[PDB]
Ligand binder design. Sequence first.
Ligand SMILES: [Zn+2]
Ligand SMILES: [Zn+2]
Ligand SMILES: [Zn+2]
Ligand SMILES: [Zn+2]
Lengths: 95, 96, 85, 86
Amino acid sequence: KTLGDFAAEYAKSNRSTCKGCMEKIEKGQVRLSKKMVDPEKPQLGMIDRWYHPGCFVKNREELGFRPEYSASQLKGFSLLATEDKEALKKQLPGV
Amino acid sequence: EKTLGDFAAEYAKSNRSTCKGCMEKIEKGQVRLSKKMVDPEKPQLGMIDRWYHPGCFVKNREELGFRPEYSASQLKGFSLLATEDKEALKKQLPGV
Amino acid sequence: DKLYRVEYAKSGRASCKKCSESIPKDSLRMAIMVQSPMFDGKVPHWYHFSCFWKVGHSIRHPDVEVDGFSELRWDDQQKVKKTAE
Amino acid sequence: DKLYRVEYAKSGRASCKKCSESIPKDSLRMAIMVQSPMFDGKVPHWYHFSCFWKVGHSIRHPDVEVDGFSELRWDDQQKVKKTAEA
DNA sequence: AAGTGTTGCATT
DNA sequence: TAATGCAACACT
Ligand SMILES: [Zn+2]
Ligand SMILES: [Zn+2]
Ligand SMILES: [Zn+2]
Ligand SMILES: [Zn+2]
């Protein structure tokens, strides 16, 4: 049961900003997101807002990432590397 | 094992390529042939691709150095063509 | 704050809601203003000039019903007023 | 018609012959003029500013040996004359 | 083989 | 979901 509004992937570029610390995310770096409406551009509007894996877990509660779900339930998680999969599994445990 | 190296065939990746057999543009998707030769106006690039319409090509088969020995099936990238296109070139570029 | 809007495509990334095709970077596009369940505001539904009148849009007087009408060219303003008649 | 040439990459499609990496659209590139068996003429072999002196090329006076030396920002031609003896 | 022109990505 | 930036392809 993979979540629909929570995805994980490698930074397709270095011009995406982490909305958890407001600093750029280097390309290739692992990044998480939640499918939510951007208050500054709601006319899109339900898009992707990215965070560093650390910045994400730091706001797990406020982002609505219930303790019920785990890292393995992330959309696009299957397309990650092994050292990256297990890295998120320890940062986003289930229950 | 028998495919030519300096003669290729493919579908026009764009509509901005010019046929050097009639000097008019080749519409995208259209089948096009080429010869790996050195463009005289840009020799610095060395051997590249100069494209022709399948018809414009066969019209200059001799001058382009496409000996009667070879056939259409020996074209580089020929295997990646459609059936109706393969056989279309086979009748235009027969072997011997 | 009108029901309709018309302008020259600010960009070629727009897409007709009828044929689902792209719209040129300067083509004549007409949109229908619809409510957005995501932020409580109107959002443009762009169509091709021909695709617009295809999805049924009987407009009496475009000059007032359509927003940004007085910005277009007289040639098109009448081509719209005629197509709407 | 000089042995060397220097300029600001007229495009970012150039490639260093040393590290085989791309060159920025305005980076300082230096090439070595070599004979071409294609059209009877010289052809540029572009390098990165750092990659250039790496292939082992000692230039005494760049201002004259290098073509287009006088045709660039003052700030650069001094940097060229500096790293020249080094 | 590197400039030019164009198309398509990526983020919002 | 369409308006910027960018980055990469296609031709030569
Ligand atoms: Zn962050
Ligand atoms: Zn032709
Ligand atoms: Zn349409
Ligand atoms: Zn280099």
